[PDB]
Write a protein that binds this DNA or RNA. Structure first.
Length: 209
DNA sequence: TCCATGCGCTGAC
DNA sequence: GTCAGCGCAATGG
């Protein structure tokens, strides 16, 4: 089994692999947290992230995308998400992701000195991101490969509050699952949406009324 | 092609 | 132990 702090591709899981639920992606080890968008350790880096339309400031352009840090939210009331209500900080997950950038951590943002040498980030695209992105899968989750943090900086988001932003760029030899060659490669490998054991059945039952 | 609301759960300290 | 949290197969206005 792969350790929680494993950087890079997970052996046995090619780009294009799909899962219906987040907990499945966790089980696979591609993205351990079942809720958080960022999986990271503040003294090491970010191992993976998921684009799921959870933050209004994300900008998805396929091989390039601007990701938003987490936080700057008031979850009092046993919540897991909310709108921005305060400034984000370069701490926890946000700091973990900045460490991937090939450059020393910088409180005012930083750029990489050869982004390709930065630490790898496993990127997963979720269908909820499709409300504002043409690269999101139609259903569930899809592993799109390895990306690297080219740079990160702070600025006011749409809500007026400060948010941390990261520019990620793809660095994977496998083709993008959303392109023609990616679509083909997925078929050849015979990859298909994976569901938890007994789900499809339980679903067919439910669909009787 | 909605939006708000809590809850169980797991990884990081 | 505490807290964060880009969920959700769910539930209600």
């Amino acid at each position: 089994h792969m350790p929680a702090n494993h950087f890079g591709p997970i052996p046995g899981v090619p780009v294009g692999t799909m899962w219906r639920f987040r907990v499945q992606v966790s089980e696979s080890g591609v993205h351990r947290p079942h809720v958080a968008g960022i999986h990271g350790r503040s003294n090491d880096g970010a191992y993976s992230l998921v684009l799921a339309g959870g933050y209004e400031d994300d900008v998805d352009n396929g091989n390039y995308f601007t990701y938003t840090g987490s936080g700057g939210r008031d979850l009092s009331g046993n919540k897991r998400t909310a709108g921005q209500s305060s400034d984000q900080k370069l701490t926890n997950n946000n700091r973990a992701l900045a460490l991937n950038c090939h450059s020393p951590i910088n409180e005012k943002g930083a750029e990489a000195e050869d982004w390709r040498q930065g630490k790898p980030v496993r990127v997963v695209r979720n269908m909820k991101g499709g409300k504002h992105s043409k690269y999101a899968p139609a259903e569930g989750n899809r592993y799109d490969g390895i990306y690297k943090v080219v740079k990160y900086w702070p600025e006011r988001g749409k809500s007026g509050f400060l948010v941390w932003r990261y520019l990620l760029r793809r660095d994977d030899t496998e083709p993008e699952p959303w392109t023609r060659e990616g679509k083909d490669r997925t078929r050849q490998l015979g990859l298909t949406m994976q569901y938890p054991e007994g789900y499809l059945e339980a679903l067919a039952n439910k669909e009787k009324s």
